[PDB]
Amino acid sequence: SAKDERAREILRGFKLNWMNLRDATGKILWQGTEDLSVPGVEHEARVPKKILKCKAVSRELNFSSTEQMEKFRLEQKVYFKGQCLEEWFFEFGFVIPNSTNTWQSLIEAASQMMPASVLTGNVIIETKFFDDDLLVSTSRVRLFYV
Numbered sequence: 001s002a003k004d005e006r007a008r009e010i011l012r013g014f015k016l017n018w019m020n021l022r023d024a025t026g027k028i029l030w031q032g033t034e035d036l037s038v039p040g041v042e043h044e045a046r047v048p049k050k051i052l053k054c055k056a057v058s059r060e061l062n063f064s065s066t067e068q069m070e071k072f073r074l075e076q077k078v079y080f081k082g083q084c085l086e087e088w089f090f091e092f093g094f095v096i097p098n099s100t101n102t103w104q105s106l107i108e109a110a111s112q113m114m115p116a117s118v119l120t121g122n123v124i125i126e127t128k129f130f131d132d133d134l135l136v137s138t139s140r141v142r143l144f145y146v
């Protein structure tokens with residue numbers, strides 16, 4: 001498949017270099033330099049339990065891409081014991097080939113949050129990276145609230 005080949009070339013040229021998450025306040029709650037978008041392994045992350053109390057979280061994601069993309073975007077779902085509680089869609093748009101870019105996003109809370117003690121180790125955030133219609137990769141991060 002031609003679309004399969006193109007998806008693989010974009011994955012091959014892509015890297016998430018670093019990311020922060022902030023109370024939308026301004027305070028950095030989490031930051032890391034591990035590429036959490038790599039597919040096929042379950043990533044793990046520890047975040048402060050107080051993040052669950054934010055009405056919104058601001059994310060800064062810095063990424064490199066050898067390939068040009070027409071409409072880079074993400075679909076992300078929070079799963080609790082296998083069940084999707086919440087979904088978000090974000091669009092970055094055009095990506096210049098061989099560029100490194102910082103993408104800021106406002107992630108808004110939906111519903112009432114279970115306690116951190118119940119959620120911890122039982123939440124997966126699944127992130128699907130698209131160029132327009134073309135699915136480039138699916139990755140998963142298991143969350144611990146600490």
Ligand SMILES: c1ccc(Cn2c(-c3ccccc3)nc3ccccc32)cc1
Nearest residue numbers: 030036037045059061076107125127141
């Ligand atoms: C720590 C940072 C990010 C996540 C999940 N995640 C999020 C995210 C975090 C919280 C709510 C919504 C999405 N955006 C991502 C972009 C690329 C890769 C992973 C992403 C889990 C733990």
Ligand SMILES: c1ccc(Cn2c(-c3ccccc3)nc3ccccc32)cc1
Nearest residue numbers: 047051052054055056057078107108109
């Ligand atoms: C504000 C916006 C988004 C969130 C997303 N979120 C998060 C989360 C938020 C920020 C970083 C890591 C996880 N864990 C959740 C568990 C169940 C439902 C939603 C969850 C929290 C606060």
